């Protein structure tokens with residue numbers, strides 16, 4: 237009953253490692269999955285993992301009694317700067333559950349209602365920037381989505397203004413973050429990471445980590461010097477006590493959580509918004525539907541929290557963009573004990589699995605055969621989608637803690653974008669997906685023609 241697992245091409249003693257010697261590893265793995273199927277083994281010197289792409293096997297991988305979150309080599313490298321923050325901690329480390337309990341309240345509905353005004357502050361800056369462009373100009377989409385998302389997590393979470401719209405170059409934190417993520421991605425295929433040919437990479441990596449930490453220093457210092465009372469994410473990080481242990485986070489872990497939330501709290505949302513706008517311009521009828529909803533629902537100068545919740549179709553458009561291009565494209569698991577996967581693949585305690593989310597989301601046995609079409613209507617009734625078929629936010633207790641924050645922000649902004657402008661894919665842009673562990677279109681530009689609808693203050 238046991239089956240021999242397919243495996244891609246090898247390179248002698250380097251096994252499959254050289255297949256990751258590309259600037260687009262996830263896309264390369266997706267192609268391999270298309271060739272090999274629902275599961276394939278991937279070996280590197282001294283290690284092995286198994287890539288899953290079907291809902292039938294992934295539903296098993298998501299059974300928390302059998303599998304727990306694993307730190308992929310990618311996350312082990314990110315941990316060099318994110319430490320035991322929530323994204324890069326093992327479930328069994330004391331600081332995971334402790335920080336989880338202390339920070340969960342920062343993402344409650346009450347908390348979301350409280351972040352709304354600040355999300356509008358940054359959204360208005362984005363709309364004003366576009367309203368102020370001259371006729372001969374265009375929009376660099378992912379660049380501006382990154383300005384928006386970093387500023388939103390900075391303001392809502394830390395009462396800190398990155399003021400990204402006041403810069404024509406990326407904010408310094410972004411430059412160093414991108415370089416650090418790129419280095420972790422690039423280090424995946426190094427068979428000999430310690431060879432002196434990598435000393436410059438190591439030196440630059442440390443410099444980038446320093447830039448991120450100097451920023452964290454300013455955020456912590458600005459909060460101390462604040463005379464105003466805040467009750468945001470940072471307030472809970474600094475003062476919250478875990479109800480289980482009764483203990484608050486220590487300084488070292490707090491610094492890791494700030495770095496973690498500044499990165500996880502914006503990068504993937506900037507990817508989502510970029511991919512959603514890309515699909516909208518490539519599917520005119522869908523853009524028309526979304527724009528009609530935005531005009532019909534957003535009747536006030538600025539959106540209210542309830543109005544954003546009423547943007548159902550915009551929400552569907554965002555979920556369909558997450559289906560095709562989940563911006564944190566994979567997550568890893570390890571077998572808690574010996575177990576047999578899908579009744580054919582025996583695994584030993586400790587064996588690892590990688591869930592290739594874009595492939596899961598293209599499982600024709602779940603969705604129809606039309607998996608490559610952008611059809612928001614697939615999500616008219618999210619509750620009807622089979623369990624574990626759609627997982628852009630991970631799984632179980634280790635799922636995304638900021639899912640509702642991301643979706644609220646993206647729905648708000650995309651709704652405002654669609655209410656205020658008509659968009660044009662003026663260059664007939666060819667999708668080019670840049671990988672920095674996370675995924676984001678590169679070089680995507682559009683032209684926006686204002687509908688000249690006044691924007692309320694605030």
Ligand code: HEM
Nearest residue numbers: 322323500501504505564567628629630634636637638642
């Ligand atoms: C559409 C945008 C987003 C996507 C696609 C996304 C996706 C994910 C995924 C797939 C995981 C699980 C990773 C794994 O198992 O290795 C995760 C974890 C996490 N995300 Fe998000 N995320 C998004 C936005 C956000 C935002 C806006 C925040 C902060 C406000 C955030 C904070 C976190 C944290 C802290 C974790 C780790 C949770 C834990 O294990 O306790 N995410 N996210």
Ligand SMILES: CCCCCCCCCCCCCCCC(=O)N[C@@H](CCSC)C(=O)O
Nearest residue numbers: 280308309310318323496499500564566673
């Ligand atoms: C604290 C903030 C953290 C932000 C990090 C966000 C990460 C999102 C994850 C993207 C997934 C990375 C996928 C990388 C490709 C891959 O399959 N790597 C595998 C290769 C195994 S063979 C040596 C791995 O990393 O183990």
